[PDB]
């Protein structure tokens, strides 16, 4: 959770510590041998910005790495077989483990717009992303489910307002 500062300056390839989506685009550990993911980097980068600083700065040279460890192990303790690869069943109890209770028809039809797989099964690339796609959209949904029944009823205007959040 706390890793001093050390190299709070030379974090970027150039002088200043103004690292972001465009700069830390290809710096993380992926699982497909292609560059990790622009949209995945961005929702990680948008986790600690005191005043939209675009990177790490006073006492904020700490939280960027901590979110990786809390998910590096989380990918390991749920892979089950330990291969960096998630089967169909290896995600069923992986998601539901951190408090979800999705049914079976969800882990099936997803591999096109947000994903990038070519062999059916999802790797570490879309794992980190796929969850943030999921967790954020639950929090939206919940706010409108004032009844608390898992059944919202929006009109068209609202239906739009919401998927374009």
Annotated binding site: 12, 14, 16, 18, 23, 79, 81, 83, 85, 90, 145, 147, 149, 151
We find the least distance from the C-beta atom of residue 159 to a second copy, in angstroms, to be 6
Distance (Å) of CA 124 to CA 12, 25, 151, 155: 24, 16, 32, 37
DSSP state, residue 30 = -
- Kindly determine how many residues on this chain lie close enough to bind Zn ion according to the rule CB under 5 A: 16
Binding site partner of 9, from a second copy, Zn ion, none, Cβ cut-off 5-8 A by kind = none
Cα 157–130–44 angle (5° rounding)?
A: 95
Q: Does 120 bind a second copy (CB under 8 A)?
A: no
Select the span of 19-27, 37-45, 107-115, 132-140 touching Zn ion (CB under 5 A): 19-27
Q: Does 12 bind Zn ion (CB under 5 A)?
A: yes
CA distance 144 to 130: 22
């Amino acid at each position: 959770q706390s890793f001093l500062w050390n190299v709070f300056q030379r974090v970027d390839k150039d002088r200043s510590g103004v690292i972001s989506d465009t700069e830390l685009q290809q710096a993380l550990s992926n699982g497909t041998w292609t560059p990790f993911n622009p949209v995945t980097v961005r929702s990680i980068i948008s986790m600690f910005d005191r005043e939209n600083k675009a990177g790490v700065n006073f006492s904020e040279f700490t939280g960027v790495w901590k979110y990786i460890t809390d998910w590096q192990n989380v990918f390991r303790t749920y892979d089950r077989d330990n291969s960096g690869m998630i089967d169909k069943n290896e995600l069923k109890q992986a998601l539901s483990g951190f408090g979800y209770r999705l049914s079976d028809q969800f882990h099936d039809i997803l591999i096109r717009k947000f994903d990038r797989q070519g062999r059916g099964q999802i790797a570490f690339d879309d794992f980190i992303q796929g969850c943030i796609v999921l967790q954020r959209l639950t929090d939206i949904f919940r706010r409108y489910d004032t009844d608390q029944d898992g059944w919202i009823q929006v009109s068209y205007e609202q239906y739009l307002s919401m998927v374009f959040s």
